[PDB]
Design a protein around this ligand. Sequence first.
Ligand SMILES: CC(C)(COP(=O)(O)OP(=O)(O)OC[C@H]1O[C@@H](n2cnc3c(N)ncnc32)[C@H](O)[C@@H]1OP(=O)(O)O)[C@@H](O)C(=O)NCCC(=O)NCCS
Ligand code: NA
Length: 273
Amino acid sequence: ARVRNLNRIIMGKYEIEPWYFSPYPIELTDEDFIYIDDFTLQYFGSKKQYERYRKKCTLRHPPGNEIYRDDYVSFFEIDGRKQRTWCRNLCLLSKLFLDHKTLYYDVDPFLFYCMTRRDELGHHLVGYFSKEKESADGYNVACILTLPQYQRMGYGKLLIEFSYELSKKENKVGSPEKPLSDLGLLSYRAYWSDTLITLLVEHQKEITIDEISSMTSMTTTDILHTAKTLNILRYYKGQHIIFLNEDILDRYNRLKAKKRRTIDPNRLIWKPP
Ligand SMILES: CC(C)(COP(=O)(O)OP(=O)(O)OC[C@H]1O[C@@H](n2cnc3c(N)ncnc32)[C@H](O)[C@@H]1OP(=O)(O)O)[C@@H](O)C(=O)NCCC(=O)NCCS
Ligand code: NA
């Protein structure tokens, strides 16, 4: 009698192996897989069951308001309390790739911003980031995730950039919840670096900390840490600034050479509560 662990999830054409254990309320059997509907995120122990529900009539995108939509991606804002089932399913899926995550069942305190890529086939959920409706620490991101099958395609940086656009619209600085996984922290460091580098080349050769946080919603701490890492911190005109140098120009051009997609602030149709 085999009592197997969940060793693989079948999502669309993808067969993904979890990185960590997730509390799916499922029976342990001699099989080690479950089906995850790429639209509803519902889990099924049998292909037959999955098929049975797949036929049902359902929207083909996350259950929320589309507050951002460009030719590349869309962002749906979902209130956990309004979509408990879907969000709980999202959290169970997310935990498979997180060392730790708050109780998956309690989604009420969060707002989920799910990003989809649109094809000739429609919407495809590629990642998301949750956010406390009320954060005592002012965290502008609780958890963030790019589904495994879509990682290392630039989606994570888009998720992060979007979280800062919300903060900017809110007239507040923000920073991701600590502690961050290594993957998460390294992604933020790259984003913060790319951001200061782009500002120095496209905005001004010299910029004060205040100006930076005002334009990016990045906190003083994240700005200083990033500036020190790049060796671009100085004192000019009576205050601390970051400055441009050949290294930064080089980095900027290399960044641009990759012709990466970015978020257009003008397409964010959203008002904070
Ligand atoms: C952290 C996380 C969101 C990052 O998401 P992601 O989608 O992989 O992020 P990005 O793709 O924007 O990261 C940039 C990387 O992708 C690579 N990349 C992006 N587009 C690419 C392309 N078209 N071709 C080749 N490489 C590409 C970049 O070269 C870069 O590699 P590097 O970091 O070694 O320099 C993701 O690793 C994840 O969900 N991890 C598990 C959950 C987790 O730990 N979350 C954070 C909790 S604190
Ligand atoms: Na996180």
